[PDB]
Amino acid sequence: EPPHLSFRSFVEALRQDNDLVDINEPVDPDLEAAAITRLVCETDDKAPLFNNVIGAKDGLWRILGAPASLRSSPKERFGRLARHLALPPTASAKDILDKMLSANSIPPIEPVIVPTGPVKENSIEGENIDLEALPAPMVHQSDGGKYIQTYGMHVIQSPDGCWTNWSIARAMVSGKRTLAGLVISPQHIRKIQDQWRAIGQEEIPWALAFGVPPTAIMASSMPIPDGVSEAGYVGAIAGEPIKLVKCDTNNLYVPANSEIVLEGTLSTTKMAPEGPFGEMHGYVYPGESHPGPVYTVNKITYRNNAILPMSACGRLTDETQTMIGTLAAAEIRQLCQDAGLPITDAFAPFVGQATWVALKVDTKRLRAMKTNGKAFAKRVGDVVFTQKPGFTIHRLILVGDDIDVYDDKDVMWAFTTRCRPGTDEVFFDDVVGFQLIPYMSHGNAEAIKGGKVVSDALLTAEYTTGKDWESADFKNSYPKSIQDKVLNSWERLGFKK
Amino acid sequence: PPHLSFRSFVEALRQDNDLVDINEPVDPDLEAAAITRLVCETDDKAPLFNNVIGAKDGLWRILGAPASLRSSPKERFGRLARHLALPPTASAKDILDKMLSANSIPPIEPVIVPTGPVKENSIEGENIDLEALPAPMVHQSDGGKYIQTYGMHVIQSPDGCWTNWSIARAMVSGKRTLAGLVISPQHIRKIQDQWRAIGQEEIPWALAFGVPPTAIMASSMPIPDGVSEAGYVGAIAGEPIKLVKCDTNNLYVPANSEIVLEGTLSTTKMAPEGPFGEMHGYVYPGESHPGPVYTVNKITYRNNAILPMSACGRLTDETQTMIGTLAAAEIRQLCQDAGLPITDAFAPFVGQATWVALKVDTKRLRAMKTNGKAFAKRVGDVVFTQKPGFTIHRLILVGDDIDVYDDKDVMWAFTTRCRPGTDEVFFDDVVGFQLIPYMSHGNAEAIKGGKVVSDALLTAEYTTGKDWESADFKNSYPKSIQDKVLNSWERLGFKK
Ligand SMILES: Cc1cc2c3c(c1C)C(C)(C)CC=[N+]3c1c([nH]c(=O)[nH]c1=O)N2C[C@H](O)[C@H](O)[C@H](O)COP(=O)(O)O
Ligand SMILES: Cc1cc2c3c(c1C)C(C)(C)CC=[N+]3c1c([nH]c(=O)[nH]c1=O)N2C[C@H](O)[C@H](O)[C@H](O)COP(=O)(O)O
Ligand SMILES: [K+]
Ligand SMILES: [K+]
Ligand SMILES: [K+]
Ligand SMILES: [K+]
Ligand SMILES: [Mn+2]
Ligand SMILES: [Mn+2]
């Protein structure tokens, strides 16, 4: 199977790309594996594969850190993400987001059932399971426990059986057979948990699949619509069905070539201290647990030589910024286009710590609408901040079509020179707010409400008569004949390539 | 000595390997400025144009990018550091500390010399033809040839006591005339208004190009009203600046200047000025505005004279490395004078010289028993009512875990610690900077408001203290683990 349909083939693709370090020396899953991963994320280095995790027994487990973080070569910066999606390692951010949105407008390709697969090579059951003895990583020194679940896919089905949701939500080892996880509104895993609580079910059938098909983990991180099963969406992205096998102990289905699967239940009643966790905004709060639902593990099935993927998230740049912000930005682009707004492109600039989305406006179509910045900013915020894909995003920046929204430097130039602070902003204090952001949960107002803005970084004339300025840069302030004369002279004169 | 002589500064750049000697003929119509602009956009070596097309009887060579950035992270500010007798590895803090060092010590008065290198050559009265000199065309949509982008205007108040040195742009306007930007609240405009008020038509004036590098830095710094830059510069340099008297008036110019224009600034005569590709990265084609006329009566110049040139615009040129960073230095000082607990200030490059980050001593802040809403309003009232605050539209207050000299730390604090709208105080009534496009070409008054203070201190920083740890390699892992990882890094196959 190709890299985008097999995690084991994806790992080999990273080896072929010279984008993976096989670490054969013993590495402690207590902080050492995550510290190496964290420093890889902070320097855009090669992904670390820990082949010799201290405490591994019977094939559980190796660790792959930084599965979807950035490469250091600017022409292949997003290459590890492109290898999730059957894209070349030179793929632009636009190419990656366009591919994730490609299934939005075409029929689902439904999964196919197979009788077995690699994930059934090994098993541990019932009283033989000891999660505290497995080498689950300690990801940050002040975390509330060992966060085994940072890059696996929760599988949970609605009571009526029609909707199977695949998503990423963190979970830590809680006990011999238990995890505690973050399960918050408005996420689909919480919506489904509430649908089971409402019919009185105490224990919901659940599975957690680690090292799924790379296309599946990307879709698991993307806010596709309510009621849409990710498996069919994944099939439409990948151009073929995902092969699923039935769980041993329940009626759920997991990818047949997953590395590791936990089968069990999600409680609708019981909670345990969950957290704290070093989180996508770059913070951990020592001692600050919150109650989270209990997952109970009844069976573990795994491949020979199983690999647990791990995201050591925090300050720039890891999977929380490369996947959560950018896939939110993709779905925000689709929301805006469905509303009839002239938005061509959306990205979550890394400088925004995945709380910003920049929206590129086709200014020719904006002028046909005969509106103004104040009215347009309100409309964009009403469309986006009332819908689930806008949940994590607190600042929308509207820029014209001379700005590359995929380039943090262009977005910052537009924001700081075209948006008059206060005057050119519309504040939203009645919308749902993201409580993980420290200015929300450790801030001056309600943790779950408000704190959002749309920043109009289009200049006044862009709404009426058009661009009346020229950039004071090499590209726009000098004739092409002068630019070419300089480029052809550059190295001969003694300037660098 | 490089901080006291522009010619010695150019030889210091040569010895740092930070200068390209360009001996091929280069056109001052857009080609010199295009090379400079690309140097500024890639942080490359300063270009010295030794062969300017149209050069006449020794006028002139051109030095581009005199205070732009070097690409090596360890010496990023080395070009600014050679203005100030600092090592090329000097931090931004070192440069700003040195510029503020003269705030708290006695001025070192300039000493007069009878002659100097600047008097080696001259052109006078009817022989002056500014239109035939190779003044650069700096941007293709500029309203004329911006001869003056890095020289020091010398103008004395009517009381005789206050001599101001300052950078303000000017373009060739005719055979003997420049037209310039002279706006409130800049001291060149304050002094022009003092002369108009007592009835003087033509104010004695000089413009010195290639001045002592310490002087051009102080020329770009909003030091207080009524303080002569010459004495401040002396106290920075730890010795007197040697001045010579102009031939045709009673003003004094650095004796080793490359080129001096002597003449008058009119209080009545106006001429079309601009547009000019400016510090925010914009030019508006066809948008000139009346500016005051400068009349040139005499030019004196060194043999092999060099005109310095700032090709300003998008990042990173002298307007970002000097205008915002020196405003931030003076904003730090103002805050400390008002008794606010500010230890450090910088103008992040991402802000396009419109942002200043202020680093708060949080131990001192907790001892004041205040809150963010109150403190943000108080800091804005102190800064946005004073001249050094003029160009700055956003102040970001950060705690003392944030390196305000590092744009990544500043954006991390701003995006994660300042709740949009809730944690911001907006200033609608203060003087605004009309050069910023969102002011001059925006939705409200060009000269009033559009400012904000962003409280990027978390709620607990005001009361009981920092209660998080960064989720980064340095703060989330014990020192024993960090060392084991750093000692293993290269051997395992990661990059240095
Ligand atoms: C890539 C990724 C996305 C995480 C994530 C992480 C990663 C690495 C972690 C594990 C490292 C930190 C935790 N994460 C959480 C999270 N969403 C959530 O509700 N709880 C979280 O704990 N997300 C986002 C979540 O996956 C997206 O919001 C999906 O759109 C949710 O799927 P749904 O739309 O089907 O609800
Ligand atoms: C380094 C530098 C600073 C410029 C400047 C430029 C540069 C290269 C240019 C030439 C490239 C673009 C023009 N500049 C102007 C300017 N201030 C001003 O009032 N008009 C301007 O035209 N400044 C800033 C000015 O020098 C500072 O605000 C000083 O504090 C003014 O001195 P003063 O405090 O004595 O008034
Ligand atoms: K999902
Ligand atoms: K605007
Ligand atoms: K000055
Ligand atoms: K705050
Ligand atoms: Mn879903
Ligand atoms: Mn002054």
Residue numbers in the entry:
A (entry chain A): 14 to 510
B (entry chain B): 15 to 510
Mind quoting what the paper says about this structure?
Initial in vivo screening tested 15 UbiD homologues co-expressed with UbiX (E. coli K-12) in E. coli for conversion of 3-methylcrotonic acid into isobutene as detected by gas chromatography. TaFdc exhibited over twice the isobutene production compared to other homologues and a directed evolution approach was taken to generate a variant of TaFdc with superior isobutene production activity and selectivity for 3-methylcrotonic acid over cinnamic acid (schematically presented in Supplementary Fig. 1). In order to understand how TaFdcV mutations aid in isobutene production, crystal structures of TaFdc and TaFdcV were solved at a resolution of 1.74 and 1.89 Å, respectively. An overlay of the wild-type and the variant crystal structures shows that the key residues F447, Q200 and the catalytic network of E287–R183–E292 are unaffected by the mutations. The E292 residue side chain occupies ‘up’ and ‘down’ conformations, while weak electron density suggests a high degree of mobility for the L449 side chain. The mobile E292 and L449 gate access to the active site while the Q448W mutation in TaFdcV narrows the binding pocket. TaFdc showed decarboxylation activity with cinnamic and sorbic acid, with rates kobs = 7.2 ± 0.3 and 3.2 ± 0.3 s−1, respectively (reported for a batch with a 380:280 nm ratio of 0.067). In contrast, the wild-type TaFdc required prolonged incubation with 50 mM 3-methylcrotonic acid to achieve full spectral conversion, suggesting a substantially higher KD and/or adduct formation rate for the wild-type enzyme. The T405M and Q448W mutations are likely to be responsible for the increased selectivity for 3-methylcrotonic acid in TaFdcV by enhancing the substrate/active site shape complementarity, blocking access to larger substrates. While comparison of TaFdc and TaFdcV crystal structures reveals the basis for increased selectivity in the evolved enzyme, it is not immediately clear why 3-methylcrotonic acid can yield isobutene from Int3.
